[PDB]
Amino acid sequence: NPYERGPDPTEDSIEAIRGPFSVATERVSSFASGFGGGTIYYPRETDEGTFGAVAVAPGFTASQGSMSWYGERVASHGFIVFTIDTNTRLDAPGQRGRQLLAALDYLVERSDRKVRERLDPNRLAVMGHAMGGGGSLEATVMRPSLKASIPLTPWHLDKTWGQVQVPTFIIGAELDTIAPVSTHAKPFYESLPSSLPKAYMELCGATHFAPNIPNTTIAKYVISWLKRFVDEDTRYSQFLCPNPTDRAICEYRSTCPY
């Protein structure tokens, strides 16, 4: 696999706050086309090859600051991470989906040469919290060539997602009362195609805002999902299949094996 980066993983390595790569940043003006700008986190070391990229959207009435801890943590494992701001704080999930795509197109077409030279434009992914998680679902319908999708405590009014063909990892929060898992996260997961590589992880005692602070349970499996599907890195299947049994997880579902 020409896309494998970093040494062979252990459960300690995927739980490490800092991965094998050092990270630099690049700020993007809000006058970028089609989204509200943001911050690009990228691995500095270039001798292992180019990397895939993930655009990360915040929730309703939130900014990239609520998602900033994903920047260095995920990028240090070998990824370009773009925490974006939206055009307005009130943008809906469909709008956030379009803006995740515009952020990715920015990386491919308009980003700084330091980012462009490190990017593989064929291996892109989306992630989002709350309404941004609904935008992550929307973006996969809008661009089926995406490699992975991670809706974090997602909010969306539409409960059926049977046309998604992008591998999708939904994280729910047990005590979420803003986007309850019974009416958002779980219906979304169950409506994804039964043949799709997918998973649902519910966090014990977590609130709707659990994704907004550093969480090792979230981070270790976000890293494993992006490795498995953006990098085609089967070295990380061991952490995804069979279903994780971490104490912080109160329910896990998957279409393992993959």
Ligand SMILES: COC(=O)c1ccc(P(=O)(O)OCCO)cc1
């Ligand atoms: C029904 O009330 C609303 O307008 C509404 C407000 C927030 C969200 P959500 O994005 O999931 O949480 C915010 C995370 O920054 C969904 C709907």
Ligand SMILES: [Ca+2]
């Ligand atoms: Ca703009």
